[PDB]
Design a protein around this ligand. Structure first.
Ligand SMILES: Nc1ncnc2c1ncn2[C@@H]1O[C@H](COP(=O)(O)OP(=O)(O)OP(=O)(O)O)[C@@H](O)[C@H]1O
Ligand SMILES: Nc1ncnc2c1ncn2[C@@H]1O[C@H](COP(=O)(O)OP(=O)(O)OP(=O)(O)O)[C@@H](O)[C@H]1O
Ligand SMILES: Nc1ncnc2c1ncn2[C@@H]1O[C@H](COP(=O)(O)OP(=O)(O)O)[C@@H](O)[C@H]1O
Ligand SMILES: [Mg+2]
Ligand SMILES: [Mg+2]
Ligand SMILES: [Mg+2]
Lengths: 187, 470, 35, 470, 81, 486
């Protein structure tokens, strides 16, 4: 049965369950709904009583899957999310759930075209140059992507800025510049 | 600096999870809440901000979640002339009950090997006073030596005789590294160094620094103690320009220690059950034991050969790191000849006629040739017996047995084993005596006249006495 | 394999050793008395 | 709770994966809900790997495991003298409890360099070949190595029976408290052994630690360390102990099982990577203390069984490279009539004549030289007389003055006319003669340690008048 | 043991060569005791080559077994990871 | 400078598991944030396994890894002659940068079936035993195999020193540029070797590629391919190179380390399944090109250390299978006084006489037949005086030719003088002389022919053969010197 593979790949148990759910949701055109339902089911998962009952290794898997079953029926979820949770409970991968969740999340992180890109600087730079880099950077993108900037400030670079646009990486820092000049000085 | 927590303890391997500030590989970490100082050396980054470490002491009593502090450096040991006459362990603590070692500078036990432009090609013979060594495989000043042998053939006695002769003739800060050996031998050496005056407990004119990690230590301590001793010697060579002697006993243990953790570090075994990193670990350790243009290090390393193999990966890998191998044989020790040096298996890179002189070289090659011919004739002697040999061949066998006995020598350190007195034969006396035996100048003397004598005048006196008795 | 017979031990290496020792203790006796 | 208490995740082959137990230490003793005990060997993120000290038939998935808070330790003291205990110190001789006031960890560290001193006092085995050519001193590790049914346990039991002459006297410096550790043996073999020891009245000063073949692998792994702690009690209180590990091959096998079931990766012959450490950290605890520490000692006699004479195997090579000397027992020698079948050409004692009385030193030098020269030419009759003089009946260990006497009667010429098949006969008669009439001479040689010219001449007349009468 | 078998093979190949040469020398000198020596050394060389063939078979078996045992040790150590 | 990157997921034992790097190629060189280099050996679905060209204490989890977009390449050219370099071609002798213009990938494929011509030209070593009995041709791969300390590096170094006579001359067709790759040796051993080559003035036409024992396993693994590319530069441009891998056992060990740490399935002796592929693709690059491709050549002299003479080990088996012959060295022959300790019965050259000059062919056919007969009857020494006159003659000629093959270290002989000495030997002119003198004679006679007989030596050198005038003149010289010899 041919799959609908997501644009980015995640590997492991998290990646397999997330890819299975992404493929199942794309066949029925229910991706956004399943996304919202996994966000909610993960925040349910982080409940302390619920976390204590789900991580417990001596609880029989029968009672545990019945508990997840009724506590999903208390939410009125899609059949896709309900079947996902029952598949995770039946296989004993409930501990990976949030991981799976975030995997699916990060999958759709690129489905909306949201490109993650972090700009490390020496000292926290103000918003004017930030909108400047907003505009000059969204030139780096293909059809229809939007920036996710996370302006980090480590002064150990003492100048310039290191820009990580997705997997592209430009080093405008002054430390690499001066070290490159020094290596040319010694070599 | 950074603080993490123990998450796993399997044997001598400990996993530590750092939330902030993962330490580099080879950093030393201190475990918090322990009676004595326990150090863990980082070996791997496992991902998920967890590091795998090797413990330098025992891991009993460790608890998951116990706090671990990052020191920010590898193991740093005190270096300087204050270490002379002291005993330190792998992490630089004084283990002689004589108080702290107040040096003014500390050195990390992990460093880079000297570069290629820092090498020196000078080859100068180091006369030991031992007949077989100086004759067939002489040592050089600033060279790496290596003494190969199975269990019980005399590596320790030979290294202690070398200590005796050279170190008391030397003027340049010896260093002894006991690497995974018997503690009884450590106490013995310490005391025969105190009574020898080489270590002075008062009026600090000591000239030996001792570093000890013995058989009862975990694998990590036995794998790093050679580096600790090496670092002491390296400070003496670099920051003081002195000429250092470096005795290491036993260096095989270093390699073996790696094996004992290899699989627990998650590594597929290579051949004979050795770590996949045997050759490169040996390389990065041994390439630091070297003479540079800044100073000199003569190093004598006792190398255990398991089961008298010499083809085992550990001795076989060690062979290419040495300048003058001395291979001790059990077949020779069972003849009663000591030291049990194998003449047809020992090698020296200064056994060159342009270095030792054509007379020395020609005598050495003649001795080796007559011993090989004796080997070849012994089969014929086994079948046809002795009476059916040629006359030239009976002469060969006679001179060969005499040369075998004359390579033997009584040691000053073996005075209890033999009852004999120590003899230290000069170089020209050795060349002259062996030339005279090869020439036929002593065909009339018996062969027991050459057993355990010094110069050839002693062989003559012994023959005269052995006759005057009977 | 030059000393293969006596490096192997066994009857042919031990008999060789005994023969050599016999001959040379004889010769050492007839060499000492002539001194 | 899940910090002082855990729950069994899975149980099988004597390994329990336990949930919780967050505060448990490495090598701590835990207790299952059935009354069984275990040791925490693998601290992993999600579970603890507990080795069960018993039968895992009674442990079920879901059982409760509690902490003891104590790293494994055994009772020690003198109350254990005369008792037969299992690896954890519980008595199995059916005589009630051992009233021990002290408990001592089984995995303690060996003494360092400073607390020791050279091995000087002799450990008398009562076996002429041992006491003469491969002598043992108090504080030494002497390996008894051989194939099956060559006579290793015999040597150990002769050694234990010999110390009765010293233990019933007065001078507390010559008393030796023996400890026999039976590892992986058949239980009826140990009953036979305790019978031989009780009949000879040797059990009053002996402890028997018994981890027999049906005991769990953790118990057989742990029994040598329990015996070593029971001996270190004596070693640290100015007393002298002797411990026999019979044998360490089976302890290594038990450790290999225990490790392979904990899913630790196998090394050579599936043995774990640190089996050398397993035996070295144990045999380094046999030591001689300096007078600041009481001057007590612990002598170790490990036993190793080789397969078809392969001393080149893994475990024999390990233990040969650890110890201070080996007694080699061969089957070829055993069937030729040489009993105890000690191969002197291979038997080494790295302590040597330092561990010997002066009288025996004198006579045994001559015996060693004559026996070497005889092993060369195989005078021939003198060597035959002496080799028949080395032979000895089982469970008949001799005093040192009588050994000196017979070595003398064989080494000064007083047997060179007698018939070989009569030598043994002569021997025993001779001894009876002396021990019937010449208690003055023997008390003299014993108290003096050496043989004066007065004693030399006295036993001259003794042996001369006897050999005339015989 | 492979090293035992190699030592013994070397020793017996040497004995074979020595007896072969002694036979040739005796068959030269045979141009009653010399013929007896010739046959004795011929039989000694025959027996030596017989023993050499048996020992070569044993040697090959033992070296194949040693290679397989080491492979199995490596494979078992790798499968435990 | 916009670069595609990844993160180090984990690091240990010189292996970095790296996230990202979605477009990196197999065997592509990457650069860590520390400045260290690496090579992408495992491309896996979720990580890339990078081998680190250096010390992994500089690499931490989370470090940025950049691509370079290029397979590993090294500088090639003549600017490398006289230099000591590392595995990636950086100068390590402190004499400044390598001013090369051309770069060449270290993993190029060997020439095919058609670009080759038969190996027909001699590669003179200067060792009498090699040049006469185990001849090497230009384009051949001759293995130097032996135990430790048996004289293998000395054979390589004599072969390197010998080429000075051809490299100082004007015949461009006979010049041989040498390359010595040192894998896993001490740096002091390499410094002694470089000093020996400088004293012999052999550095001006030699490259020394040095990946020593303290260098990371990837560098030792890569050093033979770097050296082979440096020599392929000459092989492609009509010139002739010789390369000595000293030794390939250590390169196999380094590759096994890298493979075992990358969790590749181990095989016999824990070596990976493609260690044969390793050495074979290294050694098939030594070729002889036809004139349509410039006529150049590359001769390979790999070195292999056997353990206890065991040529049935895994890596010796592989490299003996790959090469065109072997020079086997014995330690028993070494200590018998036979030095170079070449075992002539075991040594072989499957090129053979096609790699000899006609003069050496003349004398060497005779010498080979005579030493073979000697080897057959050689056991009968110790008794030979009790055999035929023919057998005693075989033994006599055999020992004379044996002593004629001994040679001093660092003293390679020209082919004309080798031919003259073998002529004196296999023509009978040494039977009346007793063995203890042969070497001595061989020396004095040599001086004689060098001093007063440059015409005959020059004429043999120019002709390649011993013609009848040459033959008779040699006859006269030999008999005169012999009759007048002490
Ligand atoms: N000195 C001796 N004189 C006579 N008999 C002896 C002597 N030593 C041993 N034996 C006998 O030879 C046999 C060997 O048994 P022993 O237990 O002493 O050796 P072992 O190596 O421990 O064998 P096992 O594999 O059973 O442990 C015993 O029957 C013993 O009685
Ligand atoms: N033709 C020769 N004559 C005299 N000595 C020689 C000769 N060839 C080599 N030697 C000496 O034999 C010794 C070993 O030679 P060499 O180091 O070249 O061999 P090797 O196999 O490369 O040793 P290694 O295992 O260290 O690599 C050297 O000391 C060398 O000087
Ligand atoms: N030079 C020697 N003279 C006399 N005996 C020796 C000598 N060397 C070794 N021995 C004997 O061999 C025994 C073992 O010696 P040792 O130094 O411990 O060798 P190793 O360190 O290799 O185990 C010594 O106790 C001694 O009896
Ligand atoms: Mg020693
Ligand atoms: Mg027994
Ligand atoms: Mg070499």
């Amino acid at each position: 049965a041919k799959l609908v593979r997501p644009p980015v790949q995640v590997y492991g148990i998290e990646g397999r369950y997330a890819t299975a759910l992404y493929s199942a949701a794309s066949k029925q055109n229910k991706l956004e709904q399943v996304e919202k339902e996994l966000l909610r089911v993960a925040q349910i998962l982080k409940e302390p009583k619920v976390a204590a009952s789900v991580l417990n290794p001596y609880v029989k898997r029968s009672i545990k899957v019945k508990s997840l079953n009724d506590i999903t029926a208390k939410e009125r979820f899609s059949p896709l999310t309900t079947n996902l949770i029952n598949l995770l409970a039946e296989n004993g991968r409930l501990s990976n759930t949030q991981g799976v969740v975030s995997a699916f999340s990060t999958m759709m992180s690129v489905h909306r075209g949201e490109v993650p890109c972090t700009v490390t600087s020496a000292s926290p730079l103000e918003e004017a140059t930030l909108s400047e880099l907003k505009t000059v950077l969204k030139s780096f993108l293909s059809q229809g992507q939007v920036l996710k900037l996370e302006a980090k400030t480590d002064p150990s670079i003492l100048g310039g800025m290191i820009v990580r646009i997705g997997e592209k990486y430009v080093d405008m820092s002054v430390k690499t510049k001066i070290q490159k000049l020094g290596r040319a000085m010694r070599e | 600096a950074a603080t993490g927590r123990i998450v796993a303890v399997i044997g001598a391997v400990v996993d530590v999870q750092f939330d902030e500030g993962l330490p580099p590989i080879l950093n030393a970490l201190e475990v918090q809440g322990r009676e004595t100082r326990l150090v863990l050396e980082v070996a791997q980054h496992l991902g998920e901000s967890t590091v795998r470490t090797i413990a330098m002491d025992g891991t009993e009593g460790l608890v998951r979640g116990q706090k671990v502090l990052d020191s920010g450096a590898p193991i740093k040991i005190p270096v300087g002339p204050e270490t002379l006459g002291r005993i330190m362990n792998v992490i630089g603590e004084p283990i002689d009950e004589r108080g702290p070692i107040k040096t003014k500078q500390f050195a990390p036990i992990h460093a880079e090997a000297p570069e290629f432009m820092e090498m020196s090609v000078e080859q100068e013979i180091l006369v030991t006073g031992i007949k077989v060594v100086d004759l067939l495989a002489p040592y050089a000043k600033g060279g790496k030596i290596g003494l190969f042998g199975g269990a019980g053939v005399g590596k320790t006695v030979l290294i202690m005789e070398l200590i005796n002769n050279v170190a008391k003739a030397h003027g340049g800060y010896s260093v002894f590294a006991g690497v995974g050996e018997r503690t009884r031998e450590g106490n013995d050496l310490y005391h025969e160094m105190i009574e020898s005056g080489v270590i002075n407990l008062k009026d600090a004119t000591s000239k030996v620094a001792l570093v000890y990690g013995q058989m009862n230590e975990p694998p990590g301590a036995r794998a790093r103690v050679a580096l600790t001793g090496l670092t002491v010697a390296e400070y003496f060579r670099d920051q003081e320009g002195q000429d250092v002697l470096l005795f290491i006993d036993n260096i095989f243990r270093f390699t073996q220690a790696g094996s004992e953790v290899s699989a627990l570090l998650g590594r597929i075994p290579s051949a004979v059950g050795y770590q996949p990193t045997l050759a490169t670990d040996m390389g990065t350790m041994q390439e630091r034991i070297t003479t540079t243009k800044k100073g000199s290090i003569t190093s004598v390393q006792a190398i255990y050969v398991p089961a008298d193999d010499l083809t085992d990966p550990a001795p076989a890998t060690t062979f290419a790191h040495l300048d003058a191998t001395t291979v001790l044989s059990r077949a020779i020790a069972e003849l009663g000849i000591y030291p049990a040096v194998d003449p047809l298996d020992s090698t020296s890179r200064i056994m060159d006629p342009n270095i030792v002189g054509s007379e020395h070289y020609d005598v050495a090659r003649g001795v080796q040739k007559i011993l090989q011919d004796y080997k070849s004739l012994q089969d014929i002697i086994a079948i046809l017996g002795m009476d059916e040999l040629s006359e030239e061949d009976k002469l060969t066998v006679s001179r060969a047995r005499k040369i075998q006995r004359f390579l033997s020598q009584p040691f000053q350190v073996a005075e209890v084993f033999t009852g004999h007195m120590g003899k230290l034969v000069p170089l020209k006396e050795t060349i002259k005596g062996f030339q005279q035996i090869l020439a036929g100048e002593y065909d009339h003397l018996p062969e027991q006249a050459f057993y355990m004598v010094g110069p050839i005048e002693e062989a003559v006196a012994k023959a005269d006495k052995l006759a005057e008795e009977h | 394999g030059a000393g293969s017979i006596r490096e192997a031990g066994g009857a042919f290496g031990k008999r060789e050793q005994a023969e050599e020792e016999r001959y040379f203790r004889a010769q050492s006796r007839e060499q000492l008395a002539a001194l | 709770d899940l910090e002082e208490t855990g729950r069994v995740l899975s149980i099988g082959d004597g390994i329990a994966r336990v949930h919780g137990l967050r505060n448990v230490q490495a090598e701590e003793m835990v207790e299952f809900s059935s009354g069984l005990k275990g040791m925490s060997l693998n601290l992993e993120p999600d579970n603890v790997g507990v080795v069960v000290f018993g039968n895992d038939k009674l442990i079920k998935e879901g059982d409760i495991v509690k902490r003891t808070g104590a790293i494994v330790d055994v009772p020690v003291g003198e109350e254990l003298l005369g008792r037969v205990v299992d690896a954890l110190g519980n008595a199995i001789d059916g005589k009630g409890p051992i009233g021990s006031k002290t408990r001592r960890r089984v995995g303690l560290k060996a003494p360092g360099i400073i607390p020791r001193i050279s091995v000087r006092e002799p450990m008398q085995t009562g076996i002429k070949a041992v006491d003469s050519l491969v002598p043992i001193g108090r504080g030494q590790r002497e390996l008894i190595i051989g194939d099956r049914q060559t006579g290793k346990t015999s040597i150990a039991i002769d050694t234990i029976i010999n110390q009765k002459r010293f233990n019933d006297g007065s001078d507390e410096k010559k008393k030796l408290y023996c400890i026999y550790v039976a590892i992986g043996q058949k239980r009826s073999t140990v009953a036979q052994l305790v019978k031989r020891l009780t009949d000879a009245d040797a059990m009053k000063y002996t402890i028997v630690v018994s981890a027999t073949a049906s005991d769990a692998a953790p118990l057989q792994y742990l029994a040598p360390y329990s015996g070593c702690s029971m001996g270190e009690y004596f070693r640290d209180n100015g007393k002298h102990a002797l411990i026999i590990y019979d044998d360490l091959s089976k302890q290594a096998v038990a450790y290999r099982q225990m490790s392979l079931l904990l899913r630790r990766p196998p090394g050579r012959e599936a043995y774990p990577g640190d089996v050398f450490y397993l035996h070295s950290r144990l045999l380094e605890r046999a030591a001689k203390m300096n007078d600041a520490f009481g001057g007590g000692s612990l002598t170790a006699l490990p036993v190793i069984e080789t397969q078809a004479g392969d001393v080149s195997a893994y475990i024999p090579t390990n233990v040969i490279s650890i110890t201070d000397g080996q007694i080699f027992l061969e089957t070829e020698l055993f069937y030729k009539g040489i009993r105890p079948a000690i191969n002197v050409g291979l038997s080494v004692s790295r302590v040597g004549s330092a561990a010997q009385t002066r009288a025996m030193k004198q006579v045994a030098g001559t015996m060693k030289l004559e026996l070497a020269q005889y092993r060369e030419v195989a005078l021939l009759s003198r060597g035959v007389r002496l080799t028949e003089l080395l032979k000895q009946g089982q469970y008949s260990p001799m005093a040192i003055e009588e050994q000196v006497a017979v070595i003398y009667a064989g080494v000064r010429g007083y047997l060179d006319k007698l018939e070989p098949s009569k030598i043994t006969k002569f021997e025993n008669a001779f001894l009876s003669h002396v021990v019937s009439q010449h208690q003055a001479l023997l008390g003299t040689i014993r108290a003096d340690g050496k043989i004066s010219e007065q004693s030399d001449a006295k036993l001259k007349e003794i042996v001369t008048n006897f050999l005339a009468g015989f | 043991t492979l090293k035992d078998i190699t030592r013994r093979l070397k020793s017996i190949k040497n004995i074979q060569k020595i007896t072969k040469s002694m036979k040739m020398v005796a068959a030269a000198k045979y141009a009653s005791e010399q013929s007896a020596r010739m046959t004795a050394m011929d039989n000694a060389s025959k027996n030596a080559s017989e023993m050499i063939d048996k020992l070569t078979l044993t040697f090959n078996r033992t070296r194949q077994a040693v290679i397989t045992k080491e492979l199995i040790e490596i494979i078992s150590g790798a499968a435990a990871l």
